[PDB]
């Protein structure tokens, strides 16, 4: 229902979230310790749990209301913990095999994104992976209009309730997105040895940084 609405609002939901799960599964052991940053209702954590039954998940968000949905989703899961913290607050010490995030970090000022990527690398073990499923800006105003048309085309094709799309539009006014290549370069600046865009559908992209490989 909520998960159905996220699929209606997010072009290539299965490709982009699935790419995040696949790249983690190919980068970390079965028993990986994983931080889901801005976990919300725990959708990305849930996708990872489906693939990695033995992974320890820490779901972190500033919103207790969002994390209540995550607590309900993971009620019977003894390998899931929840932390209430802002991206800008001290991160959990870990170390972590993976730090993942979906549709959260684009809320931060650009300087705070650059600092967050560096702070994430500090809590990753050597060879650890950072993955972001992200809302990204087009590199030009003209291309941004085309990105917007492609997003609207998906929303309309998915028979999204008009009020939910209106609410989606209102939330996006507060967003501080940047182009995918700029923020992938920020991973290199943060000291990740490899950074790559795995999958992309115009405004939405899955990218990753590796802490040594
Ligand atoms: N500065 C910040 N610190 C922590 N969480 C933040 C944040 N800004 C936004 N968030 C959280 O980021 C989430 C964005 S919605 C995405 C939720 C989830 N990752 C999913 O894929 O469905 C919300 O849960 C919101 O509370
Ligand atoms: Ca948003
Ligand atoms: Na709760």
Nearest CA to ligand 1 atom 14: 104
- Which method was it determined by? X-ray
Tell me the CB-side half-sphere exposure of residue 160, using CA atoms within 13 A.
25
- Fold observed for domain 2-210: Rossmann fold (3.40.50)
DSSP string, 39-77: -TTTHHHHHHHHH-TT-EEEEEES-HHHHHHHHHHTTT-
> CA–CA separation, 149 vs 39, rounded Å?
28
Residue of the nearest CA to atom 23 in ligand 1?
Answer: 40
Ligand nearest to the CA of residue 168, numbered in listed order? 2
Give the span between the Cα atoms of 209 and 186, in whole angstroms.
Answer: 10
**Rounded CA separation 174/72 (Å):** 28
Regarding the beta carbon of 61 and ligand 1, being less than 6 Å apart is answered yes
Q: Helical H runs in 52-193?
A: 64-73, 110-123, 141-157, 162-172, 180-189
Q: The tokens of 5 are what?
A: 């609405």
The pair of structure tokens assigned to 20 is 């995040």
Residue ranges of domains in the chain = 2-210
SS3 161: coil
Q: What is the resolution of this structure in A?
A: 1.4
Breaks in the chain after residues (C–N exceeding 2.5 Å):
none
By C-alpha distance, which of 123, 137, 103, 121 is closest to 211?
121
User: Cα separations (Å) of 101 from 14, 36, 58, 143, 205?
Assistant: 15, 6, 12, 25, 12
Tell whether ligand 1 has an atom less than 6 A from the beta carbon of residue 66. yes
Which among 101, 105, 121, 116 has a CA at the least distance from the CA of 178? 105
Cβ density class 162-175: b for 16+ within 10 Å, e for less: eeebeebeeeeeee
């Amino acid at each position: 229902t909520y998960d159905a609405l996220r699929r209606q609002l997010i072009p290539s939901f299965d490709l982009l979230y699935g790419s995040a799960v696949s790249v983690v599964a190919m980068s970390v052991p079965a028993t990986a310790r994983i931080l889901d940053l801005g976990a919300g209702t725990g959708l990305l954590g849930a996708a990872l749990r489906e693939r990695l039954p033995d992974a320890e998940l820490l779901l972190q968000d500033r919103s207790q209301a969002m994390l209540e949905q995550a607590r309900q989703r993971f009620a019977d899961d003894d390998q899931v913990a929840i932390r209430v913290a802002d991206h800008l607050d001290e991160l959990p010490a870990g170390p972590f095999d993976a730090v993942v995030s979906a549709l959260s970090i684009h809320a931060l000022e650009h300087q705070d994104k650059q600092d967050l990527f560096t702070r994430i690398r500090k809590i990753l073990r050597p060879g650890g992976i950072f993955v972001n499923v992200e809302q990204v800006l087009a590199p030009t105003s003209e291309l941004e209009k085309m990105y917007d048309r492609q997003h609207e085309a998906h929303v309309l094709a998915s028979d999204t309730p008009a009020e939910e799309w209106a609410a989606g539009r209102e939330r996006m006014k507060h967003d501080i997105p940047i182009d995918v290549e700029t923020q992938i370069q920020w991973l290199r600046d943060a000291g990740f040895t490899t950074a790559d865009c795995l999958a992309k559908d115009w405004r939405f992209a899955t990218y990753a940084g590796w802490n040594g490989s």
